[PDB]
Design a protein around this ligand. Structure first.
Ligand code: NAD
Lengths: 469, 584
């Protein structure tokens, strides 16, 4: 026999908006209700700044003007809702910059970009950026436009021009937003409009939405590493960490550089007992500072690679003895895929379904492994024809691919872990779609480690999330 | 100036661990659950700021490090007390609450009642260091029992406390050299009226003050987790500095971050250096980090103490247990179970050892009809004439068979053996069939032959690959290429999951040259665009019934690899693909 136990489905998580209203569709909830309001937080006047050649300043001004005017999906997009302008939705004015905040680079970067150069272009951008630091206290978010001629040398197998510019800009606490040629092109205004407006508000300091299930007391920590080469040819590892509340947020990191680490035959590093203990102790210190001395009762630790015997003991020696610690490993690629076979009713016997598996289905396999989907059919979010499921990924892959979760600790219960991962999937503010394939902790920690890796020196500081990402 | 690395403040401590006394604070109890004074003060400040409900609530939204600085600057604008000052606590309390002693009591009974106080690594390490006589004198300003509980748990006995009651005993015990002492010191003129302290208790406080002075006359201070909020403690420290030959082995002030230090501690360190005392402002991270790095190099560790300090071995308690389900909406996988935990293999011993690369190149040059393994000893599943025929050399000793038991764990551990088993299974599978065999990237496929792409054996595959019930094409050539012949294929992999062996199938299409894959990928995308659930079900069923004999019987088909040989392999792969249904 080949009966693979029993599966279960997690109901689609709900989001929280202004005046305590809930909806599963982020864009629709923003349209009808507006962003989450907590005190003032001072995104009361989102002031922008420009950094682009004056020959390309007109298009940036045009897109900024378009940000304050309504736009329409223009077709049966099946997901996107009509954009009502920045005054609508966000309930906050957007201020165009004046002449005083129009810094630019004159002519040095064109020939360099035509030659495919790296660090020097970033340093010249940094010098103009310092010219703007002479006036920092005039705006909240900064807009940077890099033309296709500079896109020519955007990256080469590693180093990325925008990534390194952001790496050199972040440690001095000022946010930036990269606008590339795709946003001006692609002739689908509504799709672009929702993707940039939310990011601007998030980087200004606001909170677009928030998970509606926040009463539980837990925390989620995501770890990622990046191999960097410092001076005098020595290998170093930048283990970045980030802690979340059951309602997303998570505004701070712990960036830590280490030397004591083994490496398997794939380049994946493994921290020793002391390094893992130090990283987790600093993470707990960060969490306690931002929550007025509160300690979580349960802690989830998500990592892409497995946990060594030393790393498990290192984790248990960082928190108190009355805190339940549960370690989960998430694997992106799996050899399994699933098909839905419904039917019966009265008409006909069983037959394959017209649409793929549900998003929230999870299937336990063994004593330590489970198959969570986080990708597939989702109902109740259709805008073209209501009452029909939308796969939302029929263009890339005709069938969804599950992900595998392995647990190296924890008492019991697949439901809590799968629900937490599914809920954390929906709270990424840089994407305009419903969900992502991976929980936000892993992707955030990975991109932040990638940004930190490009620093020349050894960093052991605590950063903010607006200035990165 | 007067800054040392953490490494520098780990060799000095290792030598002089016996001549050191500790001055703790509220930061050495923050990791145990109890909030410090800074947390309470910040809570009061952001409540007053109208950042949240300014009457009674919790769950602040954003604290950050920019919002905190904005709030502190806004407070300082009106003329509020400077940061890190003793006046700040009571001033902010009175400002926020404005009398209403009942509301004060509700706030303190809501912020510190349901706080599960629990031990951390640093407290256990300090208790252990108090047990084995390495550290003698410990001073603190806390109103908790973390260290006492740690000592009780680690040792089993009770700690000797010399607070306000029995204060005169501290100096007597120090002179008589009663080593484990844990003396507490009160705050700034406000805890006295909290407990209605008589002037005799004030005389007691200066009693522990003389205790500190005389202890410094003979020890070194490693004060950690302190911010300088009190001025009585700072005055006592200054008086201790003023004593001749104060702290002979040096005074260390450990902070989690130098860039976030306090001006008062900098002033104290500068004064101590000016008077001629070995004072340094070291940065050793958190308290747990410092105490664990100290405990690493502690020598002559008793076995019981070491076992009690660090966490025991974490058992594999990660054992959730599922059960069968009963509901109609089901899920069909792509895995076929394999039930045969026993194979018979042949072996041969070589007088001269050979490497994997040499065996592979010899096979490539002298291709037999046999399979070989390469980890350290060659195991084969071929024929006796062939094994004599391959590399010959007459270095053979014995051909005694080697039974393979519980192949699951061996496949899970090794990698070459898993590939060998997969190759044997596929060779048994494709025997006596017209389907091809390709080994691209160790991901064995099964390509439909173009020569015979008209048999009724593939009629179902053509039917299930067409549109709207019409027959399709399972073999052809790419549109803009005359040398890019394509054919429907399936990839067969072997996977191990918790003691069971599965065979994973995946529909795919195959390209003949294998070196021109760009337009091949474009063609793959264009072909696979419209292959949804209903089409994938039919394609999988067609491939399964093409490969594994026939279905409908619902049993376990049997395949044999080289059936007419002394060393064959038999498998019992099931026909039905694993499914699941449940909830209910
Ligand atoms: N646990 C208690 O009994 C308690 C709690 C709060 C206040 N108080 C009272 O407040 C008064 C002043 O206390 P204070 O001087 O400690 O003020 P404080 O609370 O501001 O001291 C905090 C200092 O310790 C550091 N710190 C915080 N967490 C740390 C960690 N995990 N590791 C290492 N260092 C860390 C902080 O950076 C800061 O410098 C005392 O009279 C004391 O009785 C006592």
């Amino acid at each position: 026999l080949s009966q693979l136990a029993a599966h279960s489905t997690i109901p689609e998580p709900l989001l929280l908006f202004k005046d305590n209203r809930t909806d599963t569709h982020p864009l629709r909830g923003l349209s009808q209700y507006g962003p989450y309001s907590a005190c003032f937080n001072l995104p009361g006047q989102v002031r922008l700044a420009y950094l682009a050649p004056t020959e390309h300043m007109r298009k940036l001004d045009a897109i900024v003007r378009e940000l304050q005017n309504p736009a329409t999906p223009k077709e049966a997009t099946n997901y996107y809702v009509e954009y009502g302008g920045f005054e609508k939705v966000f309930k906050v004015p957007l201020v165009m910059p004046q002449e005083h905040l129009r810094c630019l680079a004159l002519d040095e970067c064109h020939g360099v970009a035509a030659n495919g150069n790296g660090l020097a272009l970033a340093d010249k951008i940094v010098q103009s950026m310092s010219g703007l630091f002479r006036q920092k206290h005039a705006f909240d978010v900064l807009l940077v436009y890099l033309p296709a001629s500079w896109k020519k040398c955007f990256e080469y197998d590693g180093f990325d021009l925008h990534d390194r510019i952001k790496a050199k800009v972040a440690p001095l606490n000022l946010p930036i937003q990269i606008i590339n040629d795709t946003a001006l092109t692609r002739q689908c205004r509504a799709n672009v409009m929702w993707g940039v407006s939310v990011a601007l508000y998030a980087k200004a300091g606001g909170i677009p939405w928030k998970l509606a299930d926040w009463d539980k007391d837990e925390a989620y920590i995501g770890l990622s590493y990046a191999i960097k080469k410092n001076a005098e040819g020595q290998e170093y590892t930048t283990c970045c960490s980030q802690v979340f509340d059951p309602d997303g947020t998570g505004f701070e990191f712990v960036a830590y550089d280490t030397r004591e680490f083994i490496t398997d035959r794939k380049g994946n590093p493994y921290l020793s007992y002391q390094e893992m203990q130090s990283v987790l102790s600093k993470s707990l210190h960060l969490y306690q500072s931002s929550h007025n001395g509160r300690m979580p009762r349960k802690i989830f630790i998500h990592k892409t690679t497995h946990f060594t015997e030393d790393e498990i003991q290192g984790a248990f020696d960082s928190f108190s003895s009355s805190t339940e610690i549960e370690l989960v490993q998430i694997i992106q690629s799996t050899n399994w895929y699933g098909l839905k076979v419904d039917g019966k009713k009265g008409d006909k016997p069983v037959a394959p379904a017209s649409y793929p598996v549900d998003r929230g289905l999870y299937q336990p396999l063994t004593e330590s492994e489970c198959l969570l989907w986080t990708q597939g059919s989702v109902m109740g979010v259709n805008q073209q024809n209501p009452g029909q499921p939308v796969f939302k990924e029929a263009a890339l892959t005709p069938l969804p691919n599950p992900i595998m979760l392995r647990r190296f600790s924890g008492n019991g219960g697949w439901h809590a872990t799968c629900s937490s991962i599914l809920a954390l999937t929906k709270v990424d503010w840089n994407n305009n779609t419903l969900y992502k394939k991976l929980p936000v902790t892993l992707v955030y920690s990975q991109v932040f480690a990638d940004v930190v890796k490009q620093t020349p020196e050894i960093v052991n500081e605590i950063y903010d999330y607006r200035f990165f990402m | 100036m007067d800054v040392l690395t953490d490494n520098e403040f780990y060799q000095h401590y290792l030598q002089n661990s016996q001549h050191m006394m500790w001055f703790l604070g509220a930061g050495t109890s923050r990791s145990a659950g109890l909030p410090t004074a800074s947390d309470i003060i910040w809570d009061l400040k952001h409540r007053y700021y109208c950042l949240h409900e300014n009457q009674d609530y919790q769950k602040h939204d954003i604290n950050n490090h920019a919002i905190k600085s904005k709030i502190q600057s806004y407070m300082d604008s009106k003329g509020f007390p400077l940061q890190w000052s003793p006046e700040e606590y009571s001033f902010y309390f009175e400002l926020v609450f404005r009398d209403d002693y009942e509301a004060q009591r509700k706030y303190l009974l809501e912020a510190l009642a349901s706080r599960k106080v629990s031990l951390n690594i640093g407290h256990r390490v300090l208790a252990a260091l108090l047990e084995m006589n390495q550290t003698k004198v410990v001073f603190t300003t806390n109103f908790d029992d973390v260290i006492e509980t740690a000592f009780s748990d680690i040792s089993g006995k009770h700690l000797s406390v010399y607070h306000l009651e029995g204060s005169y005993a501290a100096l007597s015990a120090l002179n008589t050299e009663a080593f484990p002492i844990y003396a507490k010191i009160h705050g700034d003129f406000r805890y006295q009226k909290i407990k209605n302290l008589t002037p005799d208790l004030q005389t007691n406080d200066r009693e522990i003050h003389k205790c500190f002075l005389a202890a410094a006359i003979r020890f070194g201070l490693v004060v950690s987790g302190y911010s300088g909020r009190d001025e009585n403690v700072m005055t006592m420290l200054r008086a201790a500095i003023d004593q001749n030959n104060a702290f002979p082995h040096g005074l260390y002030w450990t902070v989690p971050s130098i860039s976030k230090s306090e001006p008062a501690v900098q002033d104290l360190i500068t004064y101590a250096q000016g008077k001629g005392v070995r004072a340094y402002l070291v940065e050793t991270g958190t308290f747990d980090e410092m105490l664990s790095k100290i405990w690493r190099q502690v020598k002559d560790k008793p076995a019981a103490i070491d076992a009690k300090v660090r966490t025991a071995r974490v058992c594999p308690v990660s054992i959730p247990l599922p059960g069968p389900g009963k509901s109609f909406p089901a899920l069909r996988t792509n895995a076929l179970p394999v039930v045969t935990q026993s194979i018979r293999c042949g072996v041969v011993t070589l007088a001269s050892p050979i490497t994997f690369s040499e065996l592979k190149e010899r096979i490539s040059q002298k291709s037999p009809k046999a399979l070989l393994t390469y980890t350290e000893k060659v195991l084969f599943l071929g024929g006796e004439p062939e094994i004599r025929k391959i590399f010959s050399n007459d270095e053979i000793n014995s051909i005694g068979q080697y039974y393979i038991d519980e192949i699951a764990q061996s496949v899970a551990a090794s990698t070459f053996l898993k590939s060998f088993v997969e190759e044997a299974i596929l060779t048994a599978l494709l025997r006596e069939k017209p389907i091809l065999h390709r080994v691209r990237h160790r991901t064995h496929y099964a390509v439909i032959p173009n020569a015979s792409a008209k048999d009724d054996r593939f009629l179902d595959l053509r039917k299930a690959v067409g549109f709207k019930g019409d027959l399709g094409y399972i073999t052809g050539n790419v549109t803009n290429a005359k040398e890019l012949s394509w054919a429907e294929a399936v990839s067969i992999r072997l996977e191990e999951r918790g003691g069971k062996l599965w065979i994973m199938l995946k529909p795919e299409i195959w390209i003949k040259p294998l070196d021109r894959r760009e337009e091949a990928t474009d063609f793959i995308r264009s072909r696979r665009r419209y292959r949804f659930n209903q089409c994938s079900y039919q394609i999988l069923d067609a491939w399964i019934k093409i490969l594994f004999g026939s279905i409908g019987g619902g049993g376990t088909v049997n395949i044999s690899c080289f059936p007419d040989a002394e060393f064959k392999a038999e498998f019992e792969i099931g026909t039905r693909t694993a499914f699941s249904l449940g909830v209910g």
